[PDB]
């Protein structure tokens, strides 16, 4: 009886094994654009992904992760609200069973069809495992997806999903360039928060971009063909792998833009 996204093991259950689920700095949240404070002291983000090395894609039973080589400062995030250098380790998505839901973060209560998370860790801590135990250990870049025109730079990801349909399957996935997933503008909201899956540790500086990317109906359809289950087990489609919005409690969301 492991955690997941079903009726009997889904987000409203997670607190029984992970009491931090009801913590003071849980994610995701609803971003209220009229209550977010413009902070002109925030710098622009610095995304240097030109030397990124992707290695592998895998279905871990809750999403698919594309993993990068994080043994050196090859794909890093700096600037914005961050002090120091944060290395890219993986990206993944959250999506819905229908186009009107899927995202974790909401914007004035609007849900998007999916949400991309580019996960980075603070190099001062040495490794990812040590970083998740610190309040400033991780920086996650969140990007909304809406259904419209195709995103060319995502097609390489959608084409391999057939080969990692079930839990535990992996495939080599080299020379993928994550710059093809970024919107034009890098304006953002930022707030202190948490991982949105167990162990739900409160180690994340969230950077959520204002501008969504567009993907095609056919592209996100291909995400919905993946499976939560392992081979030979009963088929359960990997859909609605998102956590609902949590209480903002005593936090302020800041915007890099007015
Ligand atoms: O996440
Ligand atoms: Zn995520």
Swiss-Prot record:
- Cofactor or coenzyme needed: Zn(2+); Co(2+)
Mechanisms controlling activity: Activated by X-ray, histamine, L-adrenaline, L- and D-phenylalanine, L- and D-histidine, L-His-OMe and beta-Ala-His (carnosine).
Result of mutating residue 119 to K/R?
Strongly reduced CO(2) hydrase and p-nitrophenyl acetate esterase activities
Name of protein: Carbonic anhydrase 2
In the record, the effect of residue 62 to W is given as: Impaired activity, rescued by 4-methylimidazole (4-MI). Impaired activity, not rescued by 4-methylimidazole (4-MI)
Q: What is its EC number?
A: 4.2.1.1, 4.2.1.69
Q: Which GO terms describe its biological process?
A: angiotensin-activated signaling pathway; carbon dioxide transport; morphogenesis of an epithelium; neuron cellular homeostasis; positive regulation of cellular pH reduction; positive regulation of dipeptide transmembrane transport; positive regulation of synaptic transmission, GABAergic; regulation of chloride transport
Q: State the species of origin.
A: Homo sapiens
Please state how the activity of this protein depends on pH. Optimum pH is 6-8.
Q: Which residues bind substrate?
A: 196-197
Effect upon mutating residue 199 to A: Normal CO(2) hydrase activity, but impaired stability
Active site, renumbered: 62 (proton donor/acceptor)
What does the subunit section of this Swiss-Prot or TrEMBL entry state?
Answer: Interacts with SLC4A4. Interaction with SLC4A7 regulates SLC4A7 transporter activity. Interacts with SLC26A6 isoform 4 (via C-terminus cytoplasmic domain).
* Variant or mutagenesis effect after changing residue 195 to A: Reduced CO(2) hydrase activity
């Amino acid at each position: 009886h492991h955690w997941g996204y079903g009726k009997h093991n889904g987000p409203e259950h997670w607190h029984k094994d992970f009491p931090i689920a009801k913590g003071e700095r849980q994610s995701p949240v609803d971003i209220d654009t009229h209550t977010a404070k413009y902070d002109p002291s925030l710098k622009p983000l610095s995304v240097s992904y030109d030397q990124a090395t992707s290695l592998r894609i895998l279905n871990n039973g809750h999403a698919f992760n594309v993993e990068f080589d994080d043994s050196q400062d090859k794909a890093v995030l700096k600037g914005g609200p961050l002090d120091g250098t944060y290395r890219l380790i993986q990206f993944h998505f959250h999506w819905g069973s229908l186009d009107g839901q899927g995202s974790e973060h909401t914007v004035d209560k609007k849900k998007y069809a999916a949400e991309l998370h580019l996960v980075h860790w603070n190099t001062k801590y040495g490794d990812f495992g040590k970083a998740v135990q610190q309040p400033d250990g991780l920086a996650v870049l969140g990007i909304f997806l809406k259904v419209g025109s195709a995103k060319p730079g995502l097609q390489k990801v959608v084409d391999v999903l057939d080969s990692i349909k079930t839990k535990g399957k992996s495939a080599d996935f080299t020379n993928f360039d994550p710059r093809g997933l970024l919107p034009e503008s890098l304006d953002y909201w930022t707030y202190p928060g948490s991982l949105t899956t167990p162990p739900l540790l409160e180690c994340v500086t969230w950077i959520v971009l204002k501008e969504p990317i567009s993907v095609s109906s056919e592209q996100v359809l291909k995400f919905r063909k993946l499976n939560f289950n392992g081979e030979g087990e009963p088929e359960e489609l990997m859909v609605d792998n998102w956590r609902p919005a949590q209480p903002l409690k005593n936090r302020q969301i800041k915007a890099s833009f007015k």
